[PDB]
Amino acid sequence: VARKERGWGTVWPSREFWHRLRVIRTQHHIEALVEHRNGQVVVSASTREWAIKKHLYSTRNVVACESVGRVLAERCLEAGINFMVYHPTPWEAASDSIKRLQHAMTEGGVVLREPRRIYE
Amino acid sequence: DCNRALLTRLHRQTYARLYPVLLVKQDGSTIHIRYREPRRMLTMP
Amino acid sequence: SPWRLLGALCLQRPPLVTKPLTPLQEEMADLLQQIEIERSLYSDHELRALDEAQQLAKKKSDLAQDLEDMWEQKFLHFKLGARLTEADKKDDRTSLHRKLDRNLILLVREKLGDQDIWMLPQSDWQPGETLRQTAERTLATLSENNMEAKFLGNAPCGHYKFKFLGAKVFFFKALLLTGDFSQAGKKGHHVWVSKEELGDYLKPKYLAQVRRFLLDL
Amino acid sequence: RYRRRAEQEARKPHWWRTYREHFGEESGPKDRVDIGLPPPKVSRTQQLLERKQALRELRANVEEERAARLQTARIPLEAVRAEWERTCGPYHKQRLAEYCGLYRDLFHGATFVPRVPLHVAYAVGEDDLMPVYHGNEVTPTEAAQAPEVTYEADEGSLWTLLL
Amino acid sequence: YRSKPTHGIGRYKHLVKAQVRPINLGTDYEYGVLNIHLIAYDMALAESYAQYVHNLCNHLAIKVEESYAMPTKTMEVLQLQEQGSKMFLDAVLTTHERVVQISGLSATFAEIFLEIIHSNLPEGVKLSVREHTEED
Amino acid sequence: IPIEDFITPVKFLNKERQRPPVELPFEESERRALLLKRWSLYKQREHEMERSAIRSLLEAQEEALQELRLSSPELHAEATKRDPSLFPFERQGPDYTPP
RNA sequence: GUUAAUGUAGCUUAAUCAAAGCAAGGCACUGAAAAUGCCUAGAUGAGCCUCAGCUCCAUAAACACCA
Numbered sequence: 001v002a003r004k005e006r007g008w009g010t011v012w013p014s015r016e017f018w019h020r021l022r023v024i025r026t027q028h029h030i031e032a033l034v035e036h037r038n039g040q041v042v043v044s045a046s047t048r049e050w051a052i053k054k055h056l057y058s059t060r061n062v063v064a065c066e067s068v069g070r071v072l073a074e075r076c077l078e079a080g081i082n083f084m085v086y087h088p089t090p091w092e093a094a095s096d097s098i099k100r101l102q103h104a105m106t107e108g109g110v111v112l113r114e115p116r117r118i119y120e
Numbered sequence: 121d122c123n124r125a126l127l128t129r130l131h132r133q134t135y136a137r138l139y140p141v142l143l144v145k146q147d148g149s150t151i152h153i154r155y156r157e158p159r160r161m162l163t164m165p
Numbered sequence: 166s167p168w169r170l171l172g173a174l175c176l177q178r179p180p181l182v183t184k185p186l187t188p189l190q191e192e193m194a195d196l197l198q199q200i201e202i203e204r205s206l207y208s209d210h211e212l213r214a215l216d217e218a219q220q221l222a223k224k225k226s227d228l229a230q231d232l233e234d235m236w237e238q239k240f241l242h243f244k245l246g247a248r249l250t251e252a253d254k255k256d257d258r259t260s261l262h263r264k265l266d267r268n269l270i271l272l273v274r275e276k277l278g279d280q281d282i283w284m285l286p287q288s289d290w291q292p293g294e295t296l297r298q299t300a301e302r303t304l305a306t307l308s309e310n311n312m313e314a315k316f317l318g319n320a321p322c323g324h325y326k327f328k329f330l331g332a333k334v335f336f337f338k339a340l341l342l343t344g345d346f347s348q349a350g351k352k353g354h355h356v357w358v359s360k361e362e363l364g365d366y367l368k369p370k371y372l373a374q375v376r377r378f379l380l381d382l
Numbered sequence: 383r384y385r386r387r388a389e390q391e392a393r394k395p396h397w398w399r400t401y402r403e404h405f406g407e408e409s410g411p412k413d414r415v416d417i418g419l420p421p422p423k424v425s426r427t428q429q430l431l432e433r434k435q436a437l438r439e440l441r442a443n444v445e446e447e448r449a450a451r452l453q454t455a456r457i458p459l460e461a462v463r464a465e466w467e468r469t470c471g472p473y474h475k476q477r478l479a480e481y482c483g484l485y486r487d488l489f490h491g492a493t494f495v496p497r498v499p500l501h502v503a504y505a506v507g508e509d510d511l512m513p514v515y516h517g518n519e520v521t522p523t524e525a526a527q528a529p530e531v532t533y534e535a536d537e538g539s540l541w542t543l544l545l
Numbered sequence: 546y547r548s549k550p551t552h553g554i555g556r557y558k559h560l561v562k563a564q565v566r567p568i569n570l571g572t573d574y575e576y577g578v579l580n581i582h583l584i585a586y587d588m589a590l591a592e593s594y595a596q597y598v599h600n601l602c603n604h605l606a607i608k609v610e611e612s613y614a615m616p617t618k619t620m621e622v623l624q625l626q627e628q629g630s631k632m633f634l635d636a637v638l639t640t641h642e643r644v645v646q647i648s649g650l651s652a653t654f655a656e657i658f659l660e661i662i663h664s665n666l667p668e669g670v671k672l673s674v675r676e677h678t679e680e681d
Numbered sequence: 682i683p684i685e686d687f688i689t690p691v692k693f694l695n696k697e698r699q700r701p702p703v704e705l706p707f708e709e710s711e712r713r714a715l716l717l718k719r720w721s722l723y724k725q726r727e728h729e730m731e732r733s734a735i736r737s738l739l740e741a742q743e744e745a746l747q748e749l750r751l752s753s754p755e756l757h758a759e760a761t762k763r764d765p766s767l768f769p770f771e772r773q774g775p776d777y778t779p780p
Numbered sequence: 781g782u783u784a785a786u787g788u789a790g791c792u793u794a795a796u797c798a799a800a801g802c803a804a805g806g807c808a809c810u811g812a813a814a815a816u817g818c819c820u821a822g823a824u825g826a827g828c829c830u831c832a833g834c835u836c837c838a839u840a841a842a843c844a845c846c847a
């Protein structure tokens with residue numbers, strides 16, 4: 001029932017959501033954040049993190065993206081947030097690493113594409 | 121430094137088979153040309 | 166502060182024949198070969214080889230090899246120039262024909278009145294002259310030879326000062342096209358030498374830093 | 383690259399009227415009265431060395447690289463969850479609590495990092511166990527009975543639990 | 546708004562411009578508009594070295610303007626046959642040309658550059674330096 | 682008046698059928714890939730020593746030219762200018778067999 | 781041998797979750813670049829000590845020196 005932020009739409013991405021998945025790819029590490037429109041990061045999984053770093057190999061690999069996705073799904077469920085928006089770039093949509101990140105996130109039980117507003 | 125760019129493949133999508141050929145111009149000098157014909161040598165008068 | 170004016174020259178011989186390949190470059194060469202022929206489209210020779218290999222099998226029950234063997238024998242019969250004109254001699258550092266693979270540089274021997282000099286060829290320029298003109302002049306004059314050497318810039322390569330007075334040594338780069346050495350058996354000692362050997366024969370710290378602007382290849 | 387640079391620029395405190403200003407960064411800069419347990423004291427250099435070593439060893443294996451190129455690998459999630467609980471977990475739990483305004487309604491100004499992990503669960507049946515993580519959803523049916531509580535301390539200790 | 550302190554904050558167009566002589570001063574001496582002709586019999590080789598040149602230039606901050614291919618010249622080689630006295634036989638060859646234009650240089654950078662270019666020359670590769678005026 | 686050779690010739694169209702098969706085991710695959718990574722590392726070190734080389738050369742140019750300016754001003758009047766001798770620079774690459 | 785400084789990867793982070801970001805490389809993709817995709821290598825100058833201190837080494841900037 002709450003208010004999303006309708007608007008912008010001269011610019012990108014859409015700022016309309018309660019929660020937004022944000023995937024940053026450094027030439028070294030893959031970092032997946034879940035954000036609230038406040039800019040505040042709510043729950044995140046990074047490859048700089050020792051927990052994830054030590055178990056696996058090649059921080060920048062496709063493998064790593066898949067991994068971070070699974071971790072994030074887990075922590076998301078644990079945090080009580082089942083829905084978030086993901087707004088990739090057209091060429092990030094075609095990339096394997098991110099397709100498999102989305103897959104990992106889906107099997108984890110987190111739905112992208114948030115529910116609509118009521119009496120929007 | 122002469123081997124710098126020496127190692128490459130032809131990058132065009134659809135192309136014939138290219139085979140190593142030893143070409144002698146009029147020197148006494150020999151070069152390596154990739155040519156469709158399997159012939160191991162050719163020489164110019 | 167009196168300034169002693171001395172031009173100087175770094176004389177570069179062009180490497181003639183290409184080097185052999187590092188093991189890695191060799192394996193890589195193999196790979197590139199394999200994949201190149203893997204993505205390749207047919208061949209005219211292989212069209213006439215395979216199509217006839219099958220069509221003759223169909224004309225028996227109901228060329229290419231000729232060409233192969235011809236080219237085999239025409240290649241095998243022919244013989245090629247030696248890659249080593251150095252190590253068969255194995256002696257001469259003074260031969261301009263010595264090393265085919267690397268680039269070579271000229272050294273000279275001089276014993277002066279107060280001094281013992283192993284010398285990268287040097288010039289002496291009067292204030293009215295240009296360092297360029299003096300470089301060329303000294304080159305053509307000293308070696309007693311007819312040399313076509315294309316110079317690169319009007320700017321000098323590298324500089325080293327000995328101050329007793331004060332003095333300058335300005336080294337220039339000259340690219341040798343075709344030299345003709347007159348009196349190949351002359352007494353003045355001219356040594357044609359690679360990078361490692363340039364490291365060996367050179368005593369001074371003025372000539373020690375020439376391998377700093379040299380092309381190591 | 384542009385997008386990045388821009389988002390960094392949008393996080394700085396400019397001198398002109400901005401979105402952050404009107405839309406409630408929620409007190410903006412805040413000096414935090416901290417009622418915590420003191421952070422565990424661990425040697426920087428030693429830890430660094432050990433980790434470097436571990437990663438050397440892990441990178442060394444050919445098996446691992448095979449696992450990487452062929453896109454077949456898995457992470458032992460339970461162990462990652464253990465390590466996370468042990469290491470940076472307290473901070474993440476903290477910012478979740480901040481997000482849900484635990485600190486705002488309890489101590490009013492005060493932030494603490496949850497140094498000791500707290501494991502709470504409910505019995506839904508004989509074989510069923512419903513965990514309470516930070517922020518998770520639970521049905522009152524599940525919570526009809528008092529939960530099982532677990533955390534690690536030796537005993538000279540005295541504690542107080544509050545729901 | 547003109548009256549405000551924040552005026553022209555959104556001003557951009559001066560940052561992006563969307564709308565030949567060599568300079569020889571004798572001290573700071575800029576000799577530009579130079580043509581690099583890489584000519585060889587093998588396609589792959591010529592392209593590869595052209596590539597190396599291009600990348601090298603981009604790394605050395607030397608500004609490349611146009612990189613393009615020149616028309617290939619088709620050679621028909623007539624070899625003498627011994628049996629028939631004046632009889633001719635034939636073999637077909639092709640000459641490939643690539644071009645890299647550099648817009649600026651200094652004496653020192655010219656000297657350095659040429660060193661690097663000719664040092665790294667592959668076998669069967671003919672190199673040329675010329676001036677911008679050429680007719681296609 | 683442009684005419685490019687980048688175009689694919691007509692001869693190459695329907696003769697495609699000559700090279701359908703390609704297959705590798707675990708062996709050739711992993712070998713080629715390993716080799717490729719190895720090769721990238723190698724090429725990197727190569728580019729590195731190359732750049733360090735040209736950098737050292739350029740530093741020799743700095744010390745040199747600056748030395749000549751500090752000694753005689755007339756000499757960096759002379760040598761800082763680029764000569765007309767460099768217009769048609771032509772050089773031939775090495776060969777396999779000497780003449 | 782003397783003074784003002786230092787030694788993070790090529791340039792700049794951090795040193796209470798942690799050695800971070802950017803350059804730079806390879807292969808694929810189109811003619812070259814570029815973008816993009818899949819990949820690659822990396823550091824707290826070296827020796828001890830207390831849980832910042834003592835030297836060494838080396839660079840650098842000068843001076844002295846040496847030729």
Ligand SMILES: [Mg+2]
Binds near residue numbers: 426429430
């Ligand atoms: Mg650390």
